Amino acid sequence: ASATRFIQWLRNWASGRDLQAKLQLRYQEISKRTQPPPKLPVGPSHKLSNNYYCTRDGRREAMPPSIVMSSQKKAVSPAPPIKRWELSQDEPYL
Amino acid sequence: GVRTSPTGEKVTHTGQVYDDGDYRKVRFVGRQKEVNENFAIDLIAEQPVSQVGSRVISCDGGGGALGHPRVYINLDKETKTGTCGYCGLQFRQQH
Amino acid sequence: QLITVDEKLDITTITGVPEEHIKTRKARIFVPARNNMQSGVNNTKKWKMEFDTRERWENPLMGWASTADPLSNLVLTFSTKEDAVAFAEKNGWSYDVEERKVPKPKSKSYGANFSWNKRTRVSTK
Amino acid sequence: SNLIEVFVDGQSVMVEPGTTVLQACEKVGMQIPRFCYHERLSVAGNCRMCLVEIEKAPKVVAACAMPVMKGWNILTNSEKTKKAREGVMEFLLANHPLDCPICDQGGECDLQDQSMMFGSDRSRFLEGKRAVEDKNIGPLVKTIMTRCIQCTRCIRFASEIAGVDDLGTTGRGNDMQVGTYIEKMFMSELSGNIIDICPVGALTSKPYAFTARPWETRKTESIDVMDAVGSNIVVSTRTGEVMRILPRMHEDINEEWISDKTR
Amino acid sequence: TRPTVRPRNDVAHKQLSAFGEYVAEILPKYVQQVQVSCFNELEICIHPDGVIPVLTFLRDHSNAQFKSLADLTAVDIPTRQNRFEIVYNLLSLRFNSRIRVKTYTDELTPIESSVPVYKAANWYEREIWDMFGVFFANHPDLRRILTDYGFEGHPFRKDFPLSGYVELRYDDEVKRVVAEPVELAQEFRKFDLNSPWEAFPAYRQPP
Amino acid sequence: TSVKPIFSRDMNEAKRRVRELYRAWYREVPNTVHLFQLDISVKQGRDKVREMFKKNAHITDPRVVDLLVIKGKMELEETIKVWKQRTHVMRFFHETEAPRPKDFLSKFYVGHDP
């Protein structure tokens, strides 16, 4: 930021970019190192009623695997064939 | 307070001190035995007992959520004070 | 094409264990006793194999518990007593097996607390 | 011959008459939650943690005390059952003190563990808690009675096992207190066992106080030599040092008790 | 759609179940079990003789096309007579799907090498041999890959101690690194953590 | 007792692979001493090789013998290709381990280990 006008021009020309607009050294645009206190929100389970844990218990909904076959019609694939990708419209070729 | 053994070695707040004849004190020759000087047992005794007007008082150590879990202390016995089990502060029921 | 091998299973020479820790150790095969501090029985389901406790000593620098026993923390879990014994045999460990202890079935009756003429009458509730 | 058929979650099981719902669940390997019930003590039925639904019955029954009836289907995992456990756990913890970090029971506490498995994960209690004065019953058992959950196990053990009618409840209501009323010492040769059967840190071992935590101890199953009974024991050690002695269940010797000299 | 609970996907569960029995219909000689987990992962449990036929079929069949071997590993379960479970995790790019193939062996039974099916399996089988001691027949170059030269034992077995049996230091007398029996200044502190109260009734084993 | 073999159908075929490995190790010791610039003699090296084979002489299962041979060939290849360093080759001689007398009284004096 303290570079003279001539030096700014020199490095701007050599690089071919306007380097002063996107300097890699940080100055006054950064956040202050002291901040006001936060006040974080609470989650969906912070209620005083209609909140029985048995109705929101993910761990107790897990079940043992479904036995499809054990040693105790059209052909199928594991899933539908993957759809072909599209070329980008933002920039198809780099 | 931090005392010294008859050998001169300081006694820690946990009562540790190498005895007269323990070779392990050679580790301090040319160096020093680290010993914290502020004994918490003596510091907490310095605090005055707090007089409250209820049978049950609560303590959280002070500072809100910077203290300890909030506990409730029964002050029905007059022969002694209620002591916080976390921070050691003492309470008594006035008359 | 399969082959016949009728000898007992002995893998002690291809496990890489030092000989001292094969022939001088004593495996204990047992079902852990319930922790009497709690009523839950979930830790008395499976068979355990542990080894004999060896010397622990105080570290001169810190006073920590030092050991020279590589098996001091080794505990294996087995579904049945037969599984544990078979594992001990093939690895060359001598072992003791302790039979499973199952709580006796008790006869409980709330009514007995108020017996007309028996000693089970309770003086307080 | 006289066995009757009952169902635990639809699974048939044949049980003798007089068997309680709780004992029927045991036969299929299901352990009903409990606090006041001890299989070696008289039935009390006061904690209500064992409440369980019977299919087609509109009222949950106390599993520890209710005899089974033929054809009953016990729903050990119904929403009706799960909600009963959550409600009781919520009441149990309403006045319980926030003592876990300083309480010796921490890590092997039935209240902690059953709150984890059967209770809710949060509190909605916005009041102040009860606080109770502690009571000196001798040099072996320390009492922190604000942790007591009034299960009366200690009273029943002292009366029935130890044959000492010194413990009881005084007052009533929320102010009901377990103790001796007067200043008395519970100095029986079996007194230390009440530390084991107290589900919470209300009764703890004075010699053991503050020295260890359950998860860090190594359990060596061994035998007592303080007398000729040969009581089976667990020697708890940590980092090369003996920390305490616990009973080990042996039905034909010491059941699940040890003497105070052994302990 | 309760906010803290992972949502189910029954469409994937149905598709994977149908393909599971499709594989069982085609390779009955080797397939012992087919299961789909509640989070939609398909596992084929096979006889060890079927490693090459089954893996070839999943790679090359037009309705399978599992071209990529994502992972190959082993698990040690001492309570089983065949203590080693061999697990193949395969990926199908064509059908955007994954499948797990599992078999078993014991300390003394060789498993056919799957390098012919997947060149990726080369180092995975060396790792399994190194860490578990399972021998793979017809491997082009089977030897330790992770352990030190001359290391004795197979560390990932459940009965191998955490800290092993030997440790290294520099010795001035012999002017080299030496190996000596392990001694620890502070022994590792075993913790007994399991709660004595059952956690998951849905998985309770019959008594 | 019908089990899949590794290499050898029976002990007769396995002992043939054992002898082949012993020859390979026996011929290799002179190179190992020379290449690693060890301060031991070829006689000590071959005595050590002999001691390693002898400890396993009591095996009767062909599958176990096959695995011992497989490991023996792996060990030999590590040595021939100088994947091992001098420290690895010398670990067979445990030169820094102090004597541990193996009689009851000597153990009794030093500690509790049986």
Next chain:
Amino acid sequence: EEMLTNNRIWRNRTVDIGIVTAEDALNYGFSGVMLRGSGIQWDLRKTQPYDVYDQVEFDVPIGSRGDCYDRYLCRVEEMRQSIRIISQCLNKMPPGEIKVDDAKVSPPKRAEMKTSMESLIHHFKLYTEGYQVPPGATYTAIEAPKGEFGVYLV
């Protein structure tokens, strides 16, 4: 890119060096840029997306020669796309809590731990015993920066 991309020395060192065919890359178990440099159209963020990758727009760079130079261009373009994703995350960041509101898995807030009995019990147990996980086995993978990173967790 000014230093390297069009530099003839850089191209001499990377162009046609280490060519891997699409078929070999698959059979050898390659992933990530090691597949996409050879023309394979695969990226787990697109095909098997996770936490909120299905809600952000980005392009997968694809190579045409499967050599070091094409893999270098793919990594350079992936950095640009990362910046593109980061921009959308900055704008679409939602409010709310940041761990699952279920104290049998995620520890309670410190203020709750110091006031509520249930919260203290759960804090105590989560930091000692830890949460139990239902029995099972999963292979889970992500599109890590270096390729497919997964765990087989039993």
Next chain:
Amino acid sequence: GLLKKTTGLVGLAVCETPHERLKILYTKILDVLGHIPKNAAYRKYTEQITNEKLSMVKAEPDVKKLEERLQGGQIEEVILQAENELSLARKMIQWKPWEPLVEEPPASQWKWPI
């Protein structure tokens, strides 16, 4: 349609005559499938999917519109897959996976948790 300059996949060459190549390959697969037992599930399923692909090839003379129907990527990818299927079919003749399960596992082989 205009020829492909590249398939886009390193090492996958463009095919000048994809329709003819696919007809040859599917016809071969059906031929090899004729030596497999009629009731073997592999033959029934592979015949069904092979005949579907072959029908689509005959009914669509445009490669790009054929690629869309086949849903297997570039047409050169479909050809490679047809070649892989043929190789597998020859192998399954020698494996005979349609035979009954060679052996049941031990009692608790697949029981988890233990």
Next chain:
Amino acid sequence: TYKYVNLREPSMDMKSVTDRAAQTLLWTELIRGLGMTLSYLFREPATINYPFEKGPLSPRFRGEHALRRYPSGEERCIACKLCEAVCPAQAITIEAEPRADGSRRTTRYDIDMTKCIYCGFCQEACPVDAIVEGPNFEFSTETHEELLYNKEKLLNNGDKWEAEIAANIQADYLYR
């Protein structure tokens, strides 16, 4: 969606072909690379003048450990052993017993700072904010033994650093 990184056909017209010949013969693209490093020569360097200047840190920074007190001077630690239980490295060792006034307090509290992974789990687990990771990171030693902290060392650290630690906790406790 995808994009091709390297799939472009150069123009074959006379001007383009002569532009490429000039680039080949006159090294234009190499000269352009020289311009970029030249522009950097005249930029202010990013170096800071350590130890007179310090790299920025935040209140959450995990550094050297310390044992804290209440404002009264009593120790916060009540020997619950949660930190010892959670420690991923088993770097914490604790012994405790009733103090002479009956308090629940430690007689040993060691942190092996060569085992520790400086993860901060211990300070998360502590229910009373007794054990923390302070902001100090300049405590390299000359011997290994100097990094085996016992309770006296950790209490001295707390007394030494409490002024900064308390201000850091104040800044971040509403995020915890």
